[PDB]
């Protein structure tokens, strides 16, 4: 009953401030909501070059693309057409931290999202303002919850050069926009998020993500 | 470059839960006592649906009182000025990111603030408007990687006699190059609202500040 | 390794203080480590009945015990004969801190584990103190290297009477006690933990895991 | 009950990193003076593989000297005595916990405290032995669900001039039924080695602590 099809497009605004340093990003895509996977390019419109890693923002660029087994409640199908809003915070090891807040509408066959990322206290030489970060790894979000909120917790690490891992802590509260949409109980989604190309710069750059909901341990076999 | 008698303009623009909104504050303080205070005018989003008390301390470093033996590198930062970026934790999960730049101009200091908050739970005592008060402080100041940090427990004491507890890192950054990082000390704060309307569209606002070496010496 | 046979025997003493609380806890158990599973008696002999939730000390009840694929370096395994050892800290949501830590070797068939466990700054009405505790839910392991150290952490929580969830953030560090025992790349260990049967006031208890590695999306 | 000069007898065990270790302490102090200090002597585990600092916090707040007008929790517990549970998080992922029970008869305090860490990096300032001594710092003490509870924003100063930071957070609980709790205050802290031997082996510990209520009052 969503009206969600199986292929939609996506456009996106993120604005944002990370370490005092202002930024504006475009993006359109498309995606397979029911297949759990999306894609999307990006431009930066304003505050390029990015002086910081393009990665802290990428999972900030829609728990709809996400592949939902039947057994499992699907809150963010069932928020639409009318939609939801989630809020992040993503806590890095070092310091660093993020908050990041966006409103997903729907008209037709595409989602509008209008993203916000705020930061600071990124040591200036640490991975995030050096630049030196490679990709995020695959994660598992833990679903849950809490007071009458759906809430999603993941132990997120960025890969570095020289291999070593920088570790984030994420966060995010999801509300439907509309009242009564049923919360799911205690479920698990494995992500996988990678940036498929960019310019020397990353002021352009295309993005990829593939999303599976599950119940874990024996179920998920 | 400092009087000892200053005017404060500010300008804040935030947007806490969704909630998008504009204060306005003008004030005055007395640098080298560490005192000051200002009158705030909600010009858009008011009255605000959550707890005023959140917003008060981005609401200047520059207003504290600074002993001899400690480099104060806040009245240093002037004429150009500096500007200095926050994170408030808070324990239900509430956070906030706030930032100020601030400029001088004659015997006026100008204050550009952003303050932005997310994940306050509906039922919490910042949507729920509990609060009474932030409780006095006790800023730990030092450097980290080349730039002036400080962290506070801070609490709000809420109605009902508890607490509500908040972690603050603040970080301050000088806009001219090679002015002096002072070594580790404290900063003491007490700041209060003296008085409001009864939906807070208009608050005065009060903050006293010393800064010190801890035992033994102070 | 040929060390590992397919059906192991587990030897375990507990000791450990929580909130101030003393006591020993035994056990005696079975697994099959390709399998990824494990089964375990469990009796309390000094300190019982315990004044607070049995489930906080159940993980701390052996990583060869997971069922890894060919493509994932299996530290554990690798390790024997002459074993490992792991640490842990499990900080709760409401600032109870418990840290857990196992000696563990290989005498024939059979692990030996000299387990600590230790326990403080529990709220006395907070759901480890009052018993509300109901499982742990299944979880993901996230296992990277840290200077030459492989770690993992979890996200756990406990379902607790009443339907909410208590959460602990987990931090273990394991270390072979040899020097050439090959580190595995950044991969998961989904767990799944269970009390299968226990007595009144948990003095006896029987314990289950069952655990597999895997690589996360795409593969899986 | 308390008197001006007390003496103070303990034992530490513990385990820090799989390293098990076991320490004495006989010291004096002046309760009402907050003053204290101690003769430390490893007794088993020497010498220790770790930092000797991250275990001097845990080597009792009757030694801290309380103005009239804050309650004194932990001079009002006595002769029964109180115990303390506390946490020490470090911010590259090590984490201690430590417990002090402390009991009192005549003219001493006796001390009965465990100390268990874990997760320090092999290659970090605690396990490297590069740290040099605490900074001073501030307690906020306060009332959470019926418990006296302290938190601290702690340093570790470290060779190359970096801080090691540590949030601490303590449980205080009186052994009898009835002690008034205080209101929200500080407590004050110096800590420091006085003199050690080469590997710590031996080490004498001092620690002076004042109780206030911060800005105004001073």
Sequence with gaps: ?????????????????????????????????????????????????????????????????????????????????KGYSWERSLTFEDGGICIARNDITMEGDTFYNKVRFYGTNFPANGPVMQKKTLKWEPSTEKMY??????????????????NAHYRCDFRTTYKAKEKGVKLPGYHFVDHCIEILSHDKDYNKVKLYEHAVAHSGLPDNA
């Design 145 to 162: 919850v809490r007071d009458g909120v759906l809430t999603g917790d993941i132990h997120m690490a960025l890969l570095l050069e020289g």
């Design 1 to 81: 009953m969503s009206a969600i099809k199986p292929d939609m497009k996506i456009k996106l605004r993120m604005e944002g401030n990370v370490n005092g340093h202002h930024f504006v990003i475009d993006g359109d895509g498309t995606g397979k909501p029911f297949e759990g996977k999306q894609s999307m390019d990006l431009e930066v419109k304003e505050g390029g070059p990015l002086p910081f890693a393009f990665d802290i923002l990428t999972t900030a660029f829609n728990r709809v693309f996400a592949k939902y087994p039947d057994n499992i409640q699907d809150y963010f199908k069932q928020s639409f057409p």
